[PDB]
Amino acid sequence: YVKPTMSDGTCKEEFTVNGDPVKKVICTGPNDTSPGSPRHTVPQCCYGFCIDLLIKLARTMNFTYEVHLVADGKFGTQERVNNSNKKEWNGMMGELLSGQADMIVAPLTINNERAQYIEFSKPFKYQGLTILVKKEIPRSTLDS
Amino acid sequence: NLAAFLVLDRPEERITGINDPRLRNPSDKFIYATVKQSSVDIYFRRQVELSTMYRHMEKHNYESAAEAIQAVRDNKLHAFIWDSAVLEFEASQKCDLVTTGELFFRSGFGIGMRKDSPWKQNVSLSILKSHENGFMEDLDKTWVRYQECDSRSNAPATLTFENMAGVFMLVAGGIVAGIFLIFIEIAYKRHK
Amino acid sequence: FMQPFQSTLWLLVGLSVHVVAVMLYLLDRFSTLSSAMWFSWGVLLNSGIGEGAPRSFSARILGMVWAGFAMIIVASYTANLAAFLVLDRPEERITGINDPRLRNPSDKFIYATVKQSSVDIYFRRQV
Amino acid sequence: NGTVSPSAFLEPFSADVWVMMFVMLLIVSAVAVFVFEYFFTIGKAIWLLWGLVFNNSVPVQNPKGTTSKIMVSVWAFFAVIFLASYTANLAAFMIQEEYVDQVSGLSDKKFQRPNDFSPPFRFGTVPNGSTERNIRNNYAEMHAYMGKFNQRGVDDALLSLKTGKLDAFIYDAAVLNYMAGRDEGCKLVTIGSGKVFASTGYGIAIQKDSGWKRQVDLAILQLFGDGEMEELEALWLTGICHNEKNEVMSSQLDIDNMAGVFYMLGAAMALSLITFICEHLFYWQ
Amino acid sequence: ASYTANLAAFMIQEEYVDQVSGLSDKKFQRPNDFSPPFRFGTVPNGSTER
Ligand SMILES: *[C@@H]1O[C@H](CO)[C@@H](O[C@@H]2O[C@H](CO)[C@@H](O[C@H]3O[C@H](CO)[C@@H](O)[C@H](O)[C@@H]3O)[C@H](O)[C@H]2NC(C)=O)[C@H](O)[C@H]1NC(C)=O
Ligand SMILES: *[C@@H]1O[C@H](CO)[C@@H](O[C@@H]2O[C@H](CO)[C@@H](O[C@H]3O[C@H](CO)[C@@H](O)[C@H](O)[C@@H]3O)[C@H](O)[C@H]2NC(C)=O)[C@H](O)[C@H]1NC(C)=O
Ligand SMILES: *[C@@H]1O[C@H](CO)[C@@H](O[C@@H]2O[C@H](CO)[C@@H](O)[C@H](O)[C@H]2NC(C)=O)[C@H](O)[C@H]1NC(C)=O
Ligand SMILES: *[C@@H]1O[C@H](CO)[C@@H](O)[C@H](O)[C@H]1NC(C)=O
Ligand SMILES: *[C@@H]1O[C@H](CO)[C@@H](O)[C@H](O)[C@H]1NC(C)=O
After folding, report:
1. Do E5 and C82 touch (CB under 8 A)?
2. Residue from D11, D78, C1 nearest E5 by CA
3. Nearest 5°: phi and psi at C29?
């Protein structure tokens, strides 16, 4: 969950039903509105499943961290590097194998390829796969 | 006859899922695709028995899930294949989205990077520790199962007045007769 | 006939008709005891029994709502019996290879083949 | 098995039918009394016309201004089409299938305090289980309730559920699915599609620091990616009744299944009470 | 009530179309005896035509 901040670099300190404040982190997110537009890293308010998951991990094993979103906003697989003769990765693991970011926290599946490249831990959250449609308004069709 | 007419008029169509006849072929009418260049892409690259639908995908693919659900909101891209949790979350939020049939590819999401890191064992340690204290249920009640409009009551469609609006103007015809027969009343004395 | 509506419902309506007849007689007392109950209990059956008209708008609305409930009950029961008999489909049309009964030895449904025949080795290929 | 909504009788038609019947009643009563004025009826008009559009159960003094008989007959035509459409659409609504909203999850508000509901919802399982360990570590009240409703096996809880001596069972997913698959009556279901506490799988135990671990994990993941789990799982760890439920037909319909009309019945007497006052204070006119 | 129910149930029949029993169907040999005559054909130069 990403939202823009004020000139102070912060944002509304929301709470929950029982009054517990929602954990906020400051994420330095590139301005990836359009390909070619100013795409530069600005402070933003970040919060969500991975955010409080990593804060829980930090509370457990006491690490320090930074958070930021990727530029292209894409998973990444073995694809041709600008119609060259080389099929390589891109996206999160594209820059992870390059050493840009240390650890990944995101709900990524585990196929065979990226598993061969890098090992994975236990699956923190189980999941399945479903088609989604915007149902249909119940209407009986007939003339008169 | 009218009873049989209206009761036998069932709505369409409840997508079964993998075993959908519409899924077995590129549906030019029904628009459905997935997020271009994603995990499902290589999933389908393993089973190229779907290869036909695969080259139906790029012709209507999307570069993000957010614009994919935005398309699902309006006419184009009526259906989108995706993980169960996000899609049921959006379904609970908007109260006008439905899941399929039976779910498939019963996978898991965890965490992993380069092999130079025994941190993943501590990650497994943390996930089991939260299994021993119920912390993923906290995440669920915060984000996933935050109540949020549990939709129900799938009625087999109703009947409304405008559908029968036609019969109504029939009485208007009789209203017209209110200005005709009442002169025929005088004509009843005129003829003799 | 009783499949749609329960004996409790029958008693309920048979007491409610008498109750509303008593109320109708009491209303008609204020500006007809046997004729009123006869008319109401004929209206329960949509019969032409009872030809009098209400002597006040209160009796008017009372008999009005009584007849309303009478016909709504009869409509509900005709629909209920309709749904009961139409939804009672016969069983069972065997699909064939994909029969759920075929996927397991049906102790109830007795089916087999001619012992030691071509189908025997056919099944010996697919054990 | 499911039930019928008490207020389902008004499901076919919204308030549109109420407002339309009232407005058409008033307009045609005005027209009829105006016609009769050309040749006493302003009061009986409502009774006559509603009897026409509703049911010919009460005799009415209808013959007045014989030319308006055309209008009252098309009125009766409205009647004979409207009643048909009602008895059809409502019957269609009555062909609902058994839903049973089940339990949303372990953290369902009903689950934590079943004693607030009559009767209290009873759940239990065999002790000395890891499930009991987790419940004791996290939920003391529900652990005490499970102790109140302890079991001793797997099939005994199944038969208790079959005969109504037990309301629910708590256990892992695989064996419950196996038990439900081959049931002859299919009278037992688990809900959640995997929505369970302590989400865990079947991790193969490996000797510590064994070199095979990585490659064998990659092999079983290749199997996981080969898309063969569906038919093997259908063959081995499931049953035949995992397809879907059926559209059951209701049993002997009880009053409560249409209790809404009974509610209106009460309202009827309320209305009569008001008119009783009109009888007691009618000395002003 | 029972009549309007049972007859409605009978009216929910599905399209049957008794089709043609076979090539030797009595209708097939002399379709001109029926109004309109049943018309069948195929491409010539075929083994079926032979
Ligand atoms: C885990 O829970 C139990 C912990 O004691 C263990 O043994 C069970 O103990 C209870 C309580 O003592 C026994 O209940 C009563 O059974 C008869 C009643 O007629 C008495 O003769 C016993 O003395 C006792 O009071 C259970 O019978 C007993 N269970 C068994 C199977 O012997 C359970 O065995 C443990 N369960 C598992 C699955 O390990
Ligand atoms: C088997 O049957 C045919 C035997 O001659 C053969 O050629 C077809 O011949 C007929 C009759 O001459 C042609 O019909 C007419 O077509 C146009 C009409 O506009 C005229 O220009 C022609 O001259 C002729 O009178 C067919 O057009 C002709 N068919 C073809 C495809 O050319 C068929 O070809 C044979 N069929 C097969 C499948 O081998
Ligand atoms: C991750 O790997 C192991 C798993 O916990 C950690 O090893 C522990 O080391 C701590 C001291 O740092 C000891 O007190 C524990 O006995 C060890 N536990 C186990 C199970 O090995 C290791 O320290 C963790 N890595 C980091 C960076 O903390
Ligand atoms: C984790 O514990 C170590 C050992 O005391 C401590 O120095 C550190 O502050 C904690 N976490 C980090 C890396 O800040
Ligand atoms: C339907 O289920 C109920 C319990 O919900 C049971 O009492 C009843 O007997 C069942 N009906 C049939 C026809 O089996």
Report:
1. yes
2. C1
3. -65, -40
